[model samples]
Target: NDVTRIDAIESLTEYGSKLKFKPKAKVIEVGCADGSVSNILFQHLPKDIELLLSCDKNEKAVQFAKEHYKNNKTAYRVLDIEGDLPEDLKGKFDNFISLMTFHWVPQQEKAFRNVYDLLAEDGECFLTLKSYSHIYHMFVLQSKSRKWGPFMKNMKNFLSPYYDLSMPDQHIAKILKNVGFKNIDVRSKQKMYTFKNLEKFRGLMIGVNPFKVPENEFENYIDDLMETARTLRIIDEENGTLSFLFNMNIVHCTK
Candidate 1:
């Protein structure tokens, strides 16, 4: 999990660095599990830009955020994206960033609406989701193949409801437009990452698996991806090049 999530920071740092923030610009980060990206943002963003907030549905993660990441300019809290957003947060932010986070919300429309509601009329948001219709769909399609079909087929008993919470770029842009965002730009790119150790590739399976995949059962799913790696031509002979494709679409818009 450490290496896998941190790998996501490469794309975020590039897009986030170009953003210019207004003075005292209140920025909120959704799904900041333990502030992995927040730590990176601290060094990347313009200094003294006012409060930066991190929120996630996991109470445990909120409690742990400060332990791992802290700054005079930042705050952390437990806020569920699916429920009625906290009253204190309504129209409270001048900028918003949800890195690789929003994809976890089953009701992602409501989640984006909350982002719209939190922003001032002049506020803007930078968001990204692990989209399905792009190359990542190749992973999903991989899941349905003979390689992983038997492994993931039975997981649907509980995992079905969480399937495909994140959508294609065009589909999500419409939802953003309906919520009153302009200067909307949506783009898709397949970010490629490489690994040398084949064993570590197994930890990468969490990226493809369900949210509730138990810790003890982690190996079984990773096993799927390990086999899938060979089927998909990403790895060879347990060494050398193994690459992963992040089918990501970044969204930029103003309220």
Candidate 2:
């Protein structure tokens, strides 16, 4: 589920350049999932940076990062920012970055404020979130109309319990501002992913669920969903492809 694409990595690296005050920075990443983005950032950053700390709520993810991304000279920890930050990290970072993970936090305002307090003077942070208008909603619309409607509705309930599914780009910016982030700017872009086959496309959809659905029902849902996608002619058998677009929102803020 932590699979990352090259574009996500490049976006983070481009944003990393905005950390103007510290050339060799002390950086901390919140909700760092498997360190793929961190590894990409290291490829562009200076070699002399004193520290890089990557944290995730999942201890297994941190351990994977520690083992696979070791050459980057970074530290990995299991940290849940919704709770207390490690005491050793108090006022210890020059910059912070979080990618594709903040929306899951129940207390967005409080968590952002905590990141603000954790930074040193003039410290900066970059974050990305799935925009309210992401393409997945389009799939849901299609699913709800077809034979998969019942299953789709059930899946929706499963997701509501885990994700906020609210707070569009403007609302997110307002929350960031209230958390004391200055010179805040939010931007969005649409990226397209085309799957080569029905199975691949269905697998990708299954991966999006916040929580598991009944295993027996999952196959039925996928079969119906695939049938629906085929009915829409989004899938091209000749080309072995299905195309969908994702909207990503990038936010940059400074304290």
Candidate 3:
């Protein structure tokens, strides 16, 4: 269940390691799926940070955070960054960070605007997004399968909205500027994360499957997905190690 969490934490920790906060800064984290990364972020945040609030749209994710990650200076809430936000939370944060989350929000303009409204004047934010993914490409390829097609009708919804952007960083920068953000900085990078083996890769595939299939047939469905992924060269194995290419966008802006 934590397969995705493991990859996210590893990615965020490295990207976030050099980050710092001003004295008494109030921070917020978006898309805190299960609070594991939230807790880890809290531990690494500067001691001068006044508080860290983490939120997710998923009710169960918020509950999990309350049960497992809450502390004196850290809180959890159920929130949709792209949806209407509570009046009290508007312009409340001095800093914001979202890791591996923006691509999930199909309405990029709305989400960027919300982030702009959520921060105080001159507040800063750092965000990382999956602009493209081998898994998403594999989903597209597998959707044409006669057996799997029926189950994957919703696959497009799970794919990153920026998957097709030729220059995702520039595209995002334009939106941030239009949303009233200054000091905008956006860049893209190719990420390569290696898995232990084919089994580990399969575990991740199962965890992020875009649609539901019958329990009895899920195994075969996964096998077909793996085969398709292999065919597309999205995944490659060598001496029990598996690796894939991940395209990411990193953004920094001031409100």
Candidate 4:
């Protein structure tokens, strides 16, 4: 399921309230991809509350967000958390929220520790991760068929360093615990995603990093993929709707 939906944003808002973000409080968001979710959060949050800052590592996303903020009069920046958290932001926020981003960081422990250090003594941080149980895994599994094994294994060899779904929720929680985040609580939910047609579904899969199969393998890959789709009973007719279920985990922790 797509993690960046309106319903997921609503869930995060409720989770934010659980973290005690009062009206007019200062809040920061990390790994804010394209600032789309940040925009939704801004609309839902009380007007008196400040949108302190939002950051992302993607330069293009940062540019897009900067343009968005310029038009909306919100504050944000391009920050690579893998590097240093700017000195001006240290101990300056009352709340921190990072949604659907934890797994993208290569060093989870360091990132969480940085978050802890940047927050005030009682400041709260909420984060969420797309679990390994995500529906996209079905495609990854099907790509390993006998007809596609060599091709898929070669692709994996080329992309394994960029993939981090191997870690499960418990492992993530353990890293967070080691980073000195107290009162840690983690919860997850399953959501289903429906695609209008095979083309749209294939497009979404290719957009993701792991499934960026080589161009030369496109025909064979799609052939195998369609077969898998039929076997899973996710396809009908030449073009029709298909769906897959995914699980996403949300975690709240305090400094």
Candidate 5:
């Protein structure tokens, strides 16, 4: 989900000073999910931008950005970073912001090359991606009981493909160098998310899942898991919820 909250006092703008760009520079957010990060970037720019664009793979998401983030003065398009870019958009952007995205993409090398091609000379690009193995945490905890073990083990089959998606610091740096990124800054930070309530958290988990629960048994599947939470103490009166930690790789570069 694109729900990573930016604190009122802080956001991602310090990296911009490292690249060649003016207040009105052309910026394209590559994984501009739901336009939240794009909206945040707008607040940091001073002049009327030549263009403010949001590109994602989902057409519904492009429609959504157009609908809710109208005041943003943004154009929306369906773009897959791993795929070829339109001829007109080549070397068009001054900066690219890809927050909490890119790791989901299976084609990391191709995506990097695409970004390099998309940038203007000395163009700035910032990416925050998963820096470590994704946690199958919810499944692990739920599977502690018989209610979830069998089903979740099955779901893991669907989930297994993403294991190679996220690139580590060394691998990321090497790829950037191979693709010709200059003045690269690569770093890592460990982060954790704590859930507040069982039901709401479970609902979010359900909603964000890439696969739909089996038909005719979806509600029952949910019900059984909710009940299993009580049995397994995944939700309890004392702790109130659960937590998941993730490693985030922060990378910024110039082309």
Candidate 6:
């Protein structure tokens, strides 16, 4: 079930509609997890695109992509934007596009600098990241619980850097500016996805969780997450739909 990705499909299509590709454009996607979104975005982009390098730091994810989604136009590789920049890729991309990825990056400034280095002159980027989400509340809570504490000890690494920021748009814009990306457009967009009930919402939480849950604790972990969501009053009985909120930073900038 593509529930997690399906939630983001609207944003992808909307963002894709605004994008105009140059003839023979060499594009790069920063985090093509499993290459599913890569295929979606590829279908949306203009046909003039010469290359779309879909990359992820996760070896398993890239390997999955190499076997399932590789093609002449779309190539999958392993790359960590936070790590050293590859010499061959420096100033080589005509466009940089990433969807729902940057928030995973703890060292955002360094990652933005890497994007700056990877872009060719006049290269542009369109990115969407979860600046704030109700799930973050669950993250912090689970990090403190005795049962989940050990599993979530590295919870901070999975959180968005802007989760606690008062003005995420301005903060991220300044980061890109400092990275030498001009014509920056950063907007905080509100998005909501509805589910049938708390159970359905809990299903999404479990499916989308990045942390590894031990077999014995998996059920309890999901129950705890549902309890947290209930405490937040995100469930609406009248509509019979559970709401998940995401404050996304939609950014478009040039190098």
Which structure among the candidates has the greatest lDDT? Answer: 6
Write one digit per residue (lDDT tens) for candidate 4, span 1-255.
344655456576667557587666778888767777777766665677765578888889878887765434367787877678778888877788777676567666678778887788878888776654334455566766876665555453333222445445566677778888788887766667667767767766556535445788777777676667677676665658776665667788887
True lDDT of residue 238, candidate 4: 60
In candidate 5, position 219 carries an lDDT of: 78
Q: Which stretches of candidate 4 lie over 4 Å from their true place?
A: 1-3, 13-17, 69-73, 142-169, 210-214, 236-239
- Give per-candidate clash totals: 0, 0, 0, 0, 0, 0
* Candidate 5 runs further than 4 Å off: 1-3, 7-20, 133-135, 139-167, 219-239
* Predicted structure 1, TM vs. truth: 0.80
lDDT of 3 by residue, 153-213 (tens): 8776688888887898888999899888988889787877666677777787887776888
Residue range 91-193, candidate 2, lDDT tens digits: 8888887777775576777788788878988887777765443234545555566554644555443332123335456777888888888888887666666
Off by over 4 Å in 6: 1-8, 16-18, 144-151, 197-201, 210-218, 236-240
Pick the winner on TM-score between candidates 4 and 6: 6
lDDT of each: 0.70, 0.68, 0.82, 0.68, 0.68, 0.83
- TM-score of each predicted structure versus truth: 0.80, 0.80, 0.90, 0.79, 0.78, 0.88
Better of 3 and 6 by TM-score: 3
- How are the candidates ranked when ordered by TM-score, highest leading? 3, 6, 2, 1, 4, 5
Query: Between 3 and 4, whose TM-score is larger?
Result: 3
Look at candidate 1 and give me any clashing residue pairs. Answer: none
RMSD of each: 4.2, 3.8, 2.4, 3.9, 4.1, 2.5
Which one wins by TM-score: 1 or 5? 1
Among residues 3 or more apart in sequence or in different chains, the pairs in candidate 5 whose N, CA or C atoms overlap within 3 Å are none
